[PDB]
Design a protein around this nucleic acid. Structure first.
Ligand SMILES: Nc1ccn([C@H]2C[C@H](O)[C@@H](COP(=O)(O)NP(=O)(O)OP(=O)(O)O)O2)c(=O)n1
Ligand SMILES: [Mg+2]
Ligand code: NA
Ligand code: NA
Length: 327
DNA sequence: CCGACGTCGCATCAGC
DNA sequence: GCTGATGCGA
DNA sequence: GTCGG
């Protein structure tokens, strides 16, 4: 639809959602509000009453009550108050720093640290991830135009193949779904000599190289299968320098790679459909495998998969191309 | 009335 | 020292 | 906060 149909309402519900997660630490109230925000967002009519909204799945009595107050007064008293509150609105803000969750934000504000200025005055009190997230607070909230994504994919695939030509690397996320912009780069890595029944340097070796050509600039976390870090394109000539970008790289066993590809390609909305269409025909899908339920509910063994399509040939669905996968 | 409501890899904490 | 729990992000 | 066993 259009936001301006029920935008004020969905904004309200999203704002309320963030305070539940970050300040109240009620994650199920956080999800409740987003679920409601979602079903209202795709609701193709202007909501004239709370009761009308209550008809939608995910909207119950309390939110209906809230919509009436917003409709009648243009605002929500509880929201206005908590927005004005110095403790709560500070805690909520600090969580925008990657590495700082609801718990870390709490401790910081408890002992006086409320702002980015405060965080900078207190580097010693931050862990490694949190300094990077701080250092790139601005950049991390910027989005990535597809042109830069392609430029990034260019570098990644080139270096990956350069280290070992038998690597297979796929950029997933919304990029693979042909999206016009992207929040980050999510790379999926595999190699013939890494299977479910299977070197720890397979992941390491790729990271090392991307560092050697100065693509990767910082490391948030790094293990034997999951890398999370920061990358940056080279600056062209005179022109200003690019924003630092978030990039993940995951190593997956060759046989689990396509359940991996599908799952991390998204979308969320779609992945639940494909999850829950699938249940119908007696199959469950994780990020690793597809399991056949099962005379019980007993997931039996996972069934072999060496293509994305192979999967659609276990639950009898029409292979869907990546750009028609937002539902 | 009251429990379910996402899962998993890594960094760091709590505790022995 | 190590194991297990908790915080965090995606 | 919402939904349902
Ligand atoms: N909270 C979250 C968010 C994402 N994910 C998983 C499922 C998603 O398909 C995948 C990508 O997450 P994502 O980066 O937030 N979304 P996506 O890359 O598709 O869109 P943009 O970040 O490009 O805007 O990671 C998750 O498991 N838990
Ligand atoms: Mg992404
Ligand atoms: Na409803
Ligand atoms: Na955060």
């Amino acid at each position: 639809p259009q936001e301006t149909l029920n935008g004020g309402i969905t904004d309200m519900l999203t704002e309320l959602a963030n305070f539940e997660k970050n300040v109240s630490q009620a994650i199920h109230k956080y999800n409740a509000y987003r679920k409601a925000a979602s079903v209202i967002a795709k609701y193709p009519h202007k909501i004239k009453s709370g009761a009308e909204a209550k008809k939608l799945p995910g909207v119950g009595t309390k939110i209906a009550e809230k919509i009436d107050e917003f409709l009648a007064t243009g605002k929500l008293r509880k929201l206005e108050k908590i927005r004005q509150d110095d403790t709560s609105s500070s805690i909520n803000f600090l969580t925008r720093v990657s590495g700082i969750g609801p718990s870390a934000a709490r401790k910081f504000v408890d002992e006086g640290i409320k702002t980015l200025e405060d965080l900078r005055k207190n580097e010693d009190k931050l862990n490694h991830h949190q300094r990077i997230g701080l250092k790139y607070f601005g950049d991390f909230e910027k989005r990535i135009p597809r042109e830069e994504m392609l430029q990034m994919q260019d570098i990644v695939l080139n270096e990956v193949k350069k280290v070992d030509s038998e690597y297979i690397a796929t950029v997933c996320g919304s990029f693979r779904r042909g999206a016009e912009s992207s929040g980050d780069m999510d790379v999926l890595l595999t190699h013939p000599s890494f299977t479910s029944e299977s070197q720890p340097k397979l992941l390491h070796q790729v990271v090392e190289q991307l560092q050697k050509v100065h693509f990767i600039t910082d490391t948030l976390s790094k293990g034997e299968t999951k890398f999370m870090g920061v990358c940056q394109l080279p600056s062209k000539n005179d022109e200003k320098e690019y924003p630092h970008r978030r990039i993940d790289i995951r190593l997956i066993p060759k046989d689990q790679y396509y359940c991996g590809v599908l799952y991390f390609t998204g979308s969320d909305i779609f992945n639940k459909n494909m999850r829950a269409h699938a249940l119908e025909k007696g199959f469950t899908i994780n990020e690793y495998t597809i399991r056949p339920l099962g005379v019980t509910g007993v997931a039996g063994e996972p069934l072999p998969v060496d293509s994305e399509k192979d999967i659609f040939d276990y639950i009898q669905w029409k292979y869907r191309e990546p750009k028609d996968r937002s539902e």
